[PDB]
Amino acid sequence: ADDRTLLMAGVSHDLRTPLTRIRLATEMMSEQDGYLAESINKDIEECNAIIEQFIDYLR
Amino acid sequence: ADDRTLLMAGVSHDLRTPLTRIRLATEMMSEQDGYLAESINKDIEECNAIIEQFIDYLR
């Protein structure tokens, strides 16, 4: 009966802004650093997988 | 009487792992890309400021 799911949806919503800016910065990285850009985008995906895990806990 | 603060503390805790890996990747970036590394770390700080805002809402 509480707002835990709305709270989590709000966290996902708000975090999308800086996480998207991190992805955009990686798209300007040097070619030599392509694997650093890949690592950073894997970690953005893991941030989203963590949020999904908390939402799933509340389903 | 609910677990919203513990839920948020858990989100902060879990997100620290991939956000820390993003910081570590930026420390290997090329010198020419220093401002991209700065932008990415500003966005990690904004992720943490967003979580702090949600915890503050629950204080």
- Give B4-39 as a 3 state SS string: HHHHHHHHHHHHHHHHHHHHHHHCCCCHHHHHHHHH
* Resolution of this structure in Å: 1.3
CA B14 to chain centre: 10
**Residues of B with CB below 8 A from A10's CB?**
54
Q: Which of B21, B30, B54 sits opposite A32 (nearest CB)?
A: B30
Instruction: Answer yes or no: are the C-beta atoms of B50 and A13 closer than 8 Å.
Output: no
Smallest CA–CA distance, residue A31 to chain B, in Å, is 10
Q: What are the tokens at B17?
A: 């792992």
Write down the experimental method used for this entry. Answer: X-ray
In chain B, the domains with their CATH numbers are: 1-59 (1.10.287.130)
Chain B interface includes A5 (CB < 8 A): no
Q: Are B47 and B15 in contact (CB under 8 A)?
A: yes
Residue A31, chain B, CB below 8 Å: the answer is no
Which residues of chain A lie closer than 8 angstroms to B43, CB-CB?
Answer: 18-19, 21-22, 25
Residues 6 or more apart in contact with residue A19 via CB below 8 angstroms: A44, A47, A48, B43, B47
> Which chain B residue has the Cα nearest residue A16?
B47
In our burial notation (b when 16+ CB lie closer than 10 A, e otherwise), range B3-20 reads: ebeebbeebbebbeebbe
Shortest CB distance from B29 goes to which of A17, A33, A46? A33
Maximum distance among all Cα pairs of chain A, rounded to whole angstroms? 51
Q: Is the dihedral of CA B15, B53, A7, B39 positive or negative?
A: negative
The answer to whether B18 and A26 are in contact (CB under 8 A) is: no
